[PDB]
From Swiss-Prot:
The chain holds residues 90 to 419 of 419 of the full protein. It comes from Cryphonectria parasitica. This is Endothiapepsin. Belongs to the peptidase A1 family. Disulfide bonds join C255-C290. The keyword Acetylation does not apply.
Length: 330
């Protein structure tokens, strides 16, 4: 089998991307944030505290003839941005772009943190990291990809995120028309449950390439590119007036600037992020200070190749027995 679904930025900044997902019978379509950095499929639901729902589409398991309570199972998750959510668990039929998994764990939110409530366009998350990170207790549950894997033509999914434009998530096949050149594959460590890999270095703008190993994760659920403070300082040093602001919480730069590109290494290959992809616009409406798309990972404990990096590439998440990651220019 295969599946293919369009993913769409939630806003003009590409803060996140939502993909329609069919849950239950008859289908209830929710727009989920596909997150290669987590491993829970959780949704706003008829069980979510009413005060914490602000415009999201909810999953109502009582209206699905295929929903079954996963008796005794609960879930609870905290994310990098202090956001959290928790609740109980159903199994139901879940379809993405024509690819169907029966008996998928659908985690129904009883509570969500305010970051999710404020995101009226995101109805939930669909985790695509390794199932070892799934928070369901006492019986850990498999991701949608893990459940679909054996049925897929190839045990892969691909992320082709657009820049200020829709993109595509495919399951089970590689669209060889979706990228230029070749896909360079690189080793993945699953030891932390992530699509964790090592970039071979970086360049800023037209500068030469600095060979240096950068261990990080491919995370479609993170907006920005988080890299070591040394690398981030070398980037922003090329932008007149750019500086790190503790009050804002990262590097800002004059909105009048044109930003240099940023290249990252995948083996001997190179992915070039255009400078415009690094511009996240005014820190507040009308401000002439703009927020940078490359930020320091120093306080996080891991480097994160978020959407800023991933949307510059066609990315293969190869879930073969030995997982690998593939990157191609596009």
């Amino acid at each position: 089998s295969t599946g293919s679904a369009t993913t769409t930025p939630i806003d003009s900044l590409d803060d996140a991307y939502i993909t329609p997902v069919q849950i239950g019978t008859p289908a209830q379509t929710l727009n989920l944030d596909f997150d290669t950095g987590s491993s829970d499929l959780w949704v706003f639901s008829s069980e979510t505290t009413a005060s914490e729902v602000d415009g999201q589409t909810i999953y109502t398991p009582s209206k699905s003839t295929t929903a079954k309570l996963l008796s005794g199972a609960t879930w609870s998750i905290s994310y990098g941005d202090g956001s959290s959510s928790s609740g109980d668990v159903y199994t139901d039929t879940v379809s993405v772009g024509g690819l169907t998994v029966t008996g998928q764990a659908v985690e129904s939110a009883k509570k969500v943190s305010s970051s999710f409530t404020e995101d009226s366009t995101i109805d939930g998350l669909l985790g695509l990291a390794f199932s070892t990170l799934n928070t369901v207790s006492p019986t850990q549950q498999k991701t949608f990809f893990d459940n679909a894997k054996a049925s897929l033509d190839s045990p892969v999914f691909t992320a082709d995120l657009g820049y200020h434009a829709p993109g595509t998530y495919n399951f089970g096949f590689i669209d060889t028309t979706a990228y230029t050149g070749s896909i360079t594959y690189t080793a993945v460590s699953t030891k932390q449950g992530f699509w964790e890999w090592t970039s071979t270095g970086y360049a800023v703008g037209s500068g030469t390439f600095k060979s240096t190993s950068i261990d990080g994760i491919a995370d479609t659920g993170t907006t920005l590119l988080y890299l070591p403070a040394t690398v981030v300082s070398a980037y922003w040093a090329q932008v007149s007036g750019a500086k790190s602001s503790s009050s804002v919480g990262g590097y800002v730069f004059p909105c009048s600037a044109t930003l240099p590109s940023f290249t990252f290494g995948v083996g001997s290959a190179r992915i070039v992020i255009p400078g415009d992809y690094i511009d996240f616009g005014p820190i507040s409406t009308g401000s002439s200070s703009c927020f940078g798309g490359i930020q320091s990972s120093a306080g996080i404990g891991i480097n994160i190749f978020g959407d800023v990096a991933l949307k510059a590439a066609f990315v293969v998440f190869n879930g073969a027995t030995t997982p690998t990651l593939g990157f191609a220019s596009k």
